[PDB]
Symmetry: D2
């Protein structure tokens, strides 16, 4: 499993793939089995003293592992979320970006599985973890 | 025993979630079951669009959270600790999503509920989910 | 009460009981089918076969075992002999301590039976106690 | 070197082994601790103790067994004797078949040790095989 995409290309293709969510998600780092996606909490426009929601944390987890699955499979690969689990461990720090450190554990003929830790930037103890499973059609 | 009624609960959710807005409404509330609707008009999706994974997540979470509040009242500050979602079928574009949630445990410190998500009109569920929340003192 | 595509059984209860003891000789004595319907199965774990000390209760691995055998059996009830469902995911929530000295019942339902993936869920009960001790979701890969 | 609040161990490796064999007499011969650190444990499942048939591999409930005793052992390593961690949720993803005739290793890490809840995750390998056979998350309730 070597990448068929670089950080810049994949960021471009993601904006093409899902243009609805423009300026919410950005790649900090990309590597053969690892990605760090960033959720820009300025885009959320929460009231002061507010924190990223459960759904936005889901979104971050889902986009990170999906980006990584695409990273290897390419533009053709039509991968689909089949399962998602999320454990919510610590309240995120208000006003801080959320970072998703995602690794790919399986990329098989029919099924990919990645997991992910989520951090409020600056805080080293993770706010959440998640596993995401996808199916890969023909 | 429930401490909220459908409108009491619907009201308290608008209060607590003004972000929710016109997104979620309660079709039915009973002692251990709730049917919550995700009003897909409020999504303002492209034609041929379907409720996203995060939105299904949100429906599952609010449904079980509502049912927890339905029994515990304002007092309980219940917090989501675990969520899982299985995505089984593609929702039918243009329909509301319905969430049939049942509370399986309402403990001193932990609540568990699961949920079947349906595209309105389609009988086979599109997703299912379990949600666990911890209850402070 | 629930609809899914692929509801038809190709086994009856006794033919399924027989096929499970064939494919799994270890299950004979521990797991038996109480009921089988198009959407649903009730499987029994015979608590005596576990030879637990008095006051002792069924383990998490054993509950896992019950939850997984139940949904697997329902998938096979629909797909037949030449179908090789492989477990890909399992989740389990433990809600109450099983009642010591009683069989454990798993009431599974099949929520999906697709081309490549089968999904089902299950509530575990100490027989005769109405509050479920546990709940689970099992998912299986169906290959060619 | 992942960070979490409450990293200090109150047991050392041999000490924790003693305590686990004491509190789980059935575990003796099956599970052993290869390594303990503040944030991680390696537990071994002794494949010989399963007396598996030819070319047969470790069952899912045994893999659940390893994942639960690994994370539970690591939580005990921090909270000590007087603490009663009680499993509340478990998830497992099965990714590859184990290698037949090799022990199974669970490399667990602790992600949270709170007032009421503890969370850890684990990767399962056939020993000497780089690709992990299974991943799991375990959550435990801590009473007062």
């Amino acid at each position: 499993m070597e990448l068929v995409f670089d950080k810049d290309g994949l960021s471009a293709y993601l904006e093409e793939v899902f243009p609805q969510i423009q300026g919410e998600f950005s790649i900090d780092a990309l590597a053969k089995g690892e990605i760090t996606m960033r959720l820009n909490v300025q885009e959320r426009h929460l009231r002061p003293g507010g924190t990223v929601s459960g759904p936005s944390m889901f979104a971050l987890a889902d986009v990170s592992v999906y980006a990584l699955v695409l990273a290897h499979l390419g533009r053709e690969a039509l991968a689909v979320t089949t399962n998602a689990s999320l454990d919510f461990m610590r309240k995120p720090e208000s006003g801080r970006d959320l970072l998703g450190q995602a690794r790919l554990l399986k990329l098989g003929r029919t099924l990919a599985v990645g997991d992910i830790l989520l951090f409020s930037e600056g805080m080293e103890a993770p706010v959440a973890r998640s596993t995401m499973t996808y199916s890969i059609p023909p």
